[PDB]
């Protein structure tokens, strides 16, 4: 009941970890991954550490993995419950993409916010300088311990 591909991806993640991203499978569930993404340099999230969790549904890799932040973060594409607006997690998902690809994309997403509804996203548009400084404040407050 466990696809060979998943066993391979898991083993590749543990042996070839992505820089700045820690990602390990759960002790009780091989489809469940605990993720820690370091805030990218030159972004307002720098210095912070962000907890995510990833899950591979039965129909992976036909369906996308499900990913969610567990660290409170002020970002245009992340809502109050940590849910991530990212195209490859829905309409633009293709089986040629890996778990590794997802985490890199999320990591990229932190360096390049995508304002283009949402209250935070509106703030990033109408007042980007203010929004950035709020993201930095939230990094200090909720992403350092």
């Amino acid at each position: 009941g466990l696809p060979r591909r998943i066993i391979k991806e898991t083993q590749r993640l543990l042996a070839e970890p992505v820089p700045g991203i820690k990602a390990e499978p759960d002790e009780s569930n091989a489809r469940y991954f605990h993720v820690v993404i370091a805030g990218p340099q030159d972004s307002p999230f720098e210095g912070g550490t962000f907890k995510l969790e990833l899950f591979l549904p039965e129909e992976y890799p036909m369906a996308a993995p499900k990913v969610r932040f567990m660290t409170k973060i002020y970002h245009p594409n992340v809502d109050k419950l940590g849910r991530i607006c990212l195209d490859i997690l829905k309409d633009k998902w293709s089986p040629a993409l890996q778990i590794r690809t997802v985490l890199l994309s999320i990591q990229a997403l932190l360096s390049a916010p995508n304002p283009d509804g949402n209250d935070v996203a509106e703030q990033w548009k109408t007042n980007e300088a203010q929004a950035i400084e709020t993201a930095r404040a939230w990094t200090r407050l909720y992403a350092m311990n």
């Binding site: 489809r31 469940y32 969790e53 899950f55 969610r68 409170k72 109050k80 419950l81």
Partner: protein, 140 residues
């Protein structure tokens, strides 16, 4: 078998809460919309017809802990109710008296818990109980 972890299960139930099920006689949603832990839920039951609960709306607090759904949730009524298994002064639901809670399966959910309580409102021992006036709530 493929297990869905707590948090991703709770997101599924969050979504099912918004879409709603059946005739809408029970409903549920997150208590605090910023609660990333998805722990505290607001539950609602419409009193079944042809009982002393009929035409009454009951609000409930449901707490899904760190082991949910492998372990059952905590349930308490906020709206006052006379009903077997519900503590008269606190409104806490005594798990031992609610079969869904005492014989919990991980296939169950907040929905199942609410539908179970509403079913039990139709039982012989509950349906004829004289009820408090509406508009009363427990403390805390």
């Amino acid at each position: 078998g493929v297990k869905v972890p707590r948090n991703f299960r709770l997101l599924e139930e969050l979504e099912e809460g918004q879409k709603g099920v059946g005739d809408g006689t029970v409903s549920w949603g997150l208590e605090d919309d910023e609660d990333m832990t998805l722990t505290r839920w607001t539950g609602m039951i419409i009193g079944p017809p042809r009982t002393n609960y009929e035409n009454r709306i009951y609000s409930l607090k449901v707490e899904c802990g760190p082991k949910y759904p492998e372990a059952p949730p905590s349930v308490r009524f906020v709206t006052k109710i006379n009903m077997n298994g519900i503590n008269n002064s606190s409104g806490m639901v005594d798990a031992r008296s609610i079969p869904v809670l005492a014989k919990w399966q991980n296939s169950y959910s907040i929905k199942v818990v609410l539908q179970e309580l509403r079913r039990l409102m139709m039982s012989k021992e509950n349906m004829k109980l004289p009820q408090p006036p509406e508009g009363q709530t427990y403390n805390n």
